[PDB]
Design a protein around this ligand. Structure first.
Ligand SMILES: O=c1[nH]cnc2c1ncn2[C@@H]1O[C@H](COP(=O)(O)O)[C@@H](O)[C@H]1O
Ligand SMILES: O=c1[nH]cnc2c1ncn2[C@@H]1O[C@H](COP(=O)(O)O)[C@@H](O)[C@H]1O
Ligand SMILES: O=c1[nH]cnc2c1ncn2[C@@H]1O[C@H](COP(=O)(O)O)[C@@H](O)[C@H]1O
Ligand SMILES: O=c1[nH]cnc2c1ncn2[C@@H]1O[C@H](COP(=O)(O)O)[C@@H](O)[C@H]1O
Ligand SMILES: [K+]
Ligand SMILES: [K+]
Ligand SMILES: [K+]
Ligand SMILES: [K+]
Lengths: 373, 373, 373, 373
């Protein structure tokens, strides 16, 4: 046999590292279709830094964003998301007066705060019609820090003109455009002057766009191809939709996302809008393209329910600490280093067959209780 | 970082567009195995034109055809299908006298109408035996506009001779031959003088041909290979079977289909034959190769039930408006442009892993109600 | 557009026929993973001949063989299998005296008959131990026509010596060796003097060999690789296991099988051993490697139940007529021509994605009844 | 046709053996994704030797190791595992005093025994913190034969230093490091001075690491790549996790594992800790990363239940005799020969499509009882 002392040296006899680079990995796959291979641990998980760029000029201490949906994010969610190092995007399924009030509630309230006034950071969504011009003006007056142009298909003349108008009218304000899933879409909205990109189409838990429009993209592939382009321009991208656990968050970032947006995961929490009901304690969770949401006609989302998840004061820290441990297993001390080591090919990946996915999950038990924390 | 002003220019640094061309996409896959990537929106969905060639000389305002099945299309269906810009193919699981009466009912009744008499367009199915010669003569007397030669395997001497006979005897009448799923089948029936082709074998919701005959083809692949050939001869093709939502319709056309035929989707509607019953309001839906259908012995279809879908006066417009929005997302202003941009490689596609398909649908909800419109 | 008259000629512009040849098709797939593409119909299904070589010197009018299992084939099954143009292999989970009696019952009783005595053809199974030497002698005295050496793994010194002994002692008797799934296994038993081969390992409905032994092969792949070799020596092969419908039979033969063996399909029929019981009218069906079967300790099969299928006097004709229609759709007039056209590349195949398989089956119905005939 | 006498000779006309070599087989697959092809039987299964290297200096008569989990292995399990030719690894979810007592119970009690004192061999697990240094000293005093450094991610400075310390302080003691799933991890811990490696991350039945950490590897692939490296240094590797039947054990070894570790399979047995309860006779089985286990906060395992499996005095022999039959089918007389014939390419493999896996299992039965032995 070989001398154990030569073990590390012998690795050089191999053409490349074990596993695949991100380039080799990247068809039409998404998060559950692969794993990241473990690396070398020479630091505690507590040492892991999770600072993340939301936009060109806005950086969060945590890559967590609550989605602009009327069953996920209002003032209560936005406040506590900001307090916990993330941020919330307030929905616009409401009057411009009602939305502005929610913004004021946040602004008048690791924490995400402005550098000048020390006020909590607040985001909000708007449509791309002429009526939303006045809406935005009201939100800006309320102290809005960042606006999300809310669309399933963001590459449009209407959105492009909206971007151009905001940059001229509100230069200080940061603009996140989307949604997008292709390189060509990204270039268009980057060229328009977007400060960030929202990635995803049909990956949402409550979304059926892909079913009824035949249009969208697998989330993992969308994140890679978009960010591979957008990152060259220093435009941070939000991985929006299909996120359901800590593992999805790590993978989203690995593929180039700067932050991740969550709807269903945050739906059913105490801080979410809507009241609990019993059927088991549930809350309503619905796509904004659902008939209910649109009426509150071609639906692109559904109305459903999610079980009580408790307060995000316990859930977000779980995501935070969990993501720290994830980075540790991979052998990276920050999300910045995570990005660098992936693009350099140091971090390695591996595909997962359907059998490997079943093996990866809980299997062959009479019964079990899934207590995450 | 790169200057945002160079974003669109930088796209030229890439060898090809993001995603796959239809050629690259096209083994043995069907509709659910892929997506169309979104494009550029610079028009309203209302601007989208859905005019479609049914046959060489017949063009519809909507690519919707009701299947010739005794649980789908009789006079009531055919009338309302024509009124809504589509057309109905009346079944022949009935006497020649009974079928001709149904045709007369339609003819004596965006709308699909003749250019000379302004009467509603009507289609009908027949077998390929000698007895159907007289049957057809009766249908022609009733004012039939187009005939469908109804067979699971249309590439036969019997069908070929039937085609040849009709073209000689009834030159004005348009003939749709089928079903076919291969290039060789198409050439044979095109050579015979077919004015259109019916594509599909075993893709039907109620069909088990592939199970009991081991013969057929995945619908998506069948449409591509057949139309890639048939379109060179200006022979429109009907994508028949396996259509269940708007997404399937968009994809069918993307692969080369001119129109799409629906059975199960239209079964259970008010305009369909058969009475509602309760088990939940249901209607019977059965393959014409089912024992029931054949007796009203090797079965190639099944007898089943479908829930009440309501009137097609609300369902077809939903398909219509939905398809308009689908084209908009893709960035095409008509089905003609859709065809052109696909064959040129402007429209791009993406595969879907099993995980991506699960992600694409509704996932990780306690419960939900699927209200399409 | 192109002139329709040139349609058939234009096919020559294509490098190869639509679809795949069997070579191109053939990893690790089985029957449900592919389809045969339809061809040209210029004959009635009644014209299709299904004569099939069971062994070097024995030819059946139907490629149907009942498996040697104590819940499938005793005298009653063997008699009626022979009468209907197939043959039955009597099990040996019984005394040598008991088995010989069953053989005598068949011999003393399209039909499969001897050319000299006009008596029904009869097959029987035996083990490969020394005790089975006397057993066989008794079966031969009873008028046995063909013997099956019954083993999950037929490539053994014990089986090889058993083959050699039979050929010397009983030259007239035909010997089917097996089971096998590889080329190397086939060569060994062909070299030993086998008159036919039994193909299959772990493909059985009641079999778990692959689970507990990690040894076996996908049935489709096994048939191709074995027969590709065995056919060069004029050694007919039985495709044994995993057959569940007419489609599987057509595909088995397409890949090189001369006949097919059925257990589960024939289990639960009136002619099968064991009594009906109620739980719905059921019969017991069990692997011969099951603890029950072995005790009537490492099990390689299970004990289960199957619903009443009725008499094989109606089921086998259904298989017969169904297979005729299958050949017709493909455009072949006999199983001999089927073999020839496949090996020449005239018959074409197509893969099936998981989606294509779901599409191929019954889908999207509230409910349905599967009446085959 | 060809002369049967030339059958074996004709095999030489083929470029390579039927099926795939292990290299060709080896992406991201695991055990259920493939089969081993049968070989030549020229010996009885009783002749098969299952001696296996646990570590550099420790060899077992059976490749069976019980996992260090508080619902699997305490003194009772460890004793009977050693008696039956395997070994048990005692968990450390208990005080150092409690663990040492369990070791003494084993030491003071085909059988796995020391060569000098004839005492039963005993293994035990420990953490990699400073407190475990004293713990180990107590275990060594109790007569511990081998220590397992218990971690989901063994490639750490803490584990590396722990290894280095043990080799200096307790030279006689054998050290198994892990867990690992990559080549780079292996080299690191081999270089540190490991006497054996524990392979697996997220493949456990009760483990969700891959879900919550996005980190791990398909078990089959992990075993191959790690052992392909580790075996060059004569470092035996334990395939840990995802083992559920005899088939998995055979495959684990085929890919390079020297022994296999079982948790769930041995959970629910009489010799396991914890009492039976009724819900059907069940026992608790839980991941050591479960909240319950950790509290007896980011969970990486779950708490569940498994049905009563009976005594391992009947189960392990079943595994033993089953593995013998498995080797026989493959045509190897020992696990050593198994290794040699695989690396030489004599043993062949075959992929399994999802259809082939369904075909491989029990299918198309009304009902069945799975009696393994
Ligand atoms: O009705 C809808 N149609 C289309 N996309 C939607 C709809 N509702 C929400 N989404 C998207 O889906 C995301 C939520 O995905 P989830 O986090 O998987 O629930 C949102 O942030 C939106 O990007
Ligand atoms: O009994 C049958 N055997 C074979 N194909 C059938 C049968 N009944 C209907 N079909 C085909 O299946 C289509 C309906 O498919 P669906 O729209 O998926 O229900 C029809 O238009 C026919 O082309
Ligand atoms: O106990 C068993 N172990 C292994 N193979 C078996 C056993 N019982 C039956 N078989 C095989 O499985 C075939 C039946 O497959 P089926 O037709 O799919 O039920 C038989 O003809 C045998 O070749
Ligand atoms: O809580 C846990 N987190 C991660 N891995 C675990 C945990 N509990 C057990 N394992 C691993 O899973 C193996 C058991 O796998 P099983 O044999 O498939 O149940 C153990 O031997 C450990 O290697
Ligand atoms: K797992
Ligand atoms: K979705
Ligand atoms: K079908
Ligand atoms: K099986």
């Amino acid at each position: 046999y070989r001398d154990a002392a030569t073990a590390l040296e012998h690795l050089a006899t191999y053409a490349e590292k074990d596993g695949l680079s991100v380039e080799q990995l990247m068809g039409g796959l998404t998060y559950n279709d692969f794993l990241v291979l473990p690396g070398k641990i020479d630091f505690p998980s507590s040492e892991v830094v999770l600072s993340s760029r939301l936009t060109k000029k806005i950086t969060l201490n945590a890559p967590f964003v609550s989605s602009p949906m009327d069953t996920v994010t209002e003032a209560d969610m936005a406040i506590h998301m900001a307090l916990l190092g993330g941020i919330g995007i307030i929905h616009h399924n409401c009057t411009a007066e009602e939305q502005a009030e929610m913004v004021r509630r946040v602004k008048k309230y690791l924490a995400s705060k402005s550098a000048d006034t020390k006020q909590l950071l607040c985001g909000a969504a708007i449509g791309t019609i002429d009526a939303d011009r006045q809406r935005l003006a009201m939100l800006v007056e309320a102290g809005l820090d960042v606006v999300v142009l809310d669309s399933s298909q963001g590459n449009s003349v209407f959105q492009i003109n909206m971007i151009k108008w905001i940059k001229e009218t509100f230069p200080d304000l940061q603009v996140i455009a989307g949604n997008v899933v292709t390189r060509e879409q990204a270039a268009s909205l980057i060229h328009a002057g977007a400060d960030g990109l929202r990635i995803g189409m049909g990956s949402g838990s409550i979304c059926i766009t892909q079913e009824v429009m035949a249009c969208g993209r697998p989330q993992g592939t969308a994140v890679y191809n978009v960010t591979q382009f957008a990152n060259q321009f220093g435009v941070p991208c939000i991985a929006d939709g299909g996120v359901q656990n800590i593992g999805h968050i790590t993978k989203a970032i690995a593929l180039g996302a700067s932050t991740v947006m969550m709807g269903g995961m945050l739906a059913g929490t105490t801080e979410s809008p809507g009241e609990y009901f019993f059927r088991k304690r549930l809350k309503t969770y619905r796509g904004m393209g659902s008939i209910d949401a649109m009426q509150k006609l071609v639906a692109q989302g559904v109305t459903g329910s999610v079980i009580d998840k408790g307060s995000i004061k316990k859930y977000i820290p779980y995501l935070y600490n969990g993501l720290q441990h994830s980075c540790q297993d991979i052998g990276v001390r920050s999300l910045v280093e995570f990005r660098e080591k992936v693009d350099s090919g140091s971090v390695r990946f591996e595909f997962r067959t359907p059998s490997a996915q079943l093996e990866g999950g809980v299997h062959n038990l009479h019964s079990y209780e899934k207590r995450l924390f």
